[PDB]
């Protein structure tokens, strides 16, 4: 039996969601990008409800809850794709019905972004990332998202501390063979931050070109 915060995050983990690319629409970059932005829009709803299960998140000001999500949302989306992809080779599981290989990434104009997501996948495969570690890192990525606009700095630090403590407690109990495993997990966050910045810049530019329709919530997070 391990850390209660980790157990709680596991039960809070949202259900799988399908991409459901429109089978009447011809394959194209615009279809692939529409499908991914539509999938992100739906996952963002699910991410908002998930964050409310994080101990202490709901006690922040709605302003601070918004700030954390506005900074971390794309990291949370990327970590989901990364976790789903760990048993695959050079493929990204956006959804069980939407697995992109290199050819498809090329066809969508996503080769560079997807190669960086695959770099995250490669590191977590080598580390044998567990679901417990995944859900704890997602919560840490949210709490540690470095928003410029935080009101209650000390409360956000306490949230970081609670989740960091849960990771350290989990690793101390489950991974006695590697007393630095928690730190190794924290050392994966810079690549997640870098890949997230690349993703947001890329989809912001697609927003500017105006050829890919996007729903309200995805647009709001891109514009933040």
């Amino acid at each position: 039996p391990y850390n209660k915060i980790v157990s709680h995050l596991l039960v809070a983990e949202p259900e799988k969601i399908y991409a459901m690319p429109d089978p009447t629409v011809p394959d194209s970059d615009i279809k692939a990008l529409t499908t991914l932005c539509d999938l992100a829009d739906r996952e963002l709803v699910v991410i908002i409800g998930w964050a409310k299960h994080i101990p202490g998140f709901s006690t922040l000001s709605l302003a601070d809850q918004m700030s954390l999500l506005q900074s971390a949302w794309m990291e949370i989306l990327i970590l989901g794709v990364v976790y789903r992809s760990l048993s695959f080779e050079d493929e990204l599981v956006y959804a069980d019905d939407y697995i992109m290989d290199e050819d498809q990434s090329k066809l969508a104009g996503l080769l560079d972004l997807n190669n960086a997501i695959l770099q995250l996948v490669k590191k977590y495969k080598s580390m044998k990332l567990e679901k417990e570690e995944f859900v704890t890192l997602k919560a840490i990525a949210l709490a540690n998202s470095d928003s410029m606009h935080i009101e209650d700095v000390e409360a956000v630090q306490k949230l970081q501390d609670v989740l960091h403590e849960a990771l350290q407690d989990y690793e101390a109990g489950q991974h006695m063979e590697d007393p630095r495993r928690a730190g190794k997990m924290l050392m994966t966050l810079p690549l997640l931050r870098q890949t997230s910045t690349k993703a947001v810049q890329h989809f912001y530019n697609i927003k500017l070109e105006g050829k890919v329709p996007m729903h309200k919530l995805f647009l709001e997070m891109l514009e933040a």
Partner: peptide, 12 residues
């Protein structure tokens, strides 16, 4: 205060 994100965060 027109934000969908704020609306979903308030949503019970």
């Amino acid at each position: 205060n027109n934000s969908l994100l704020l609306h979903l965060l308030k949503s019970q």
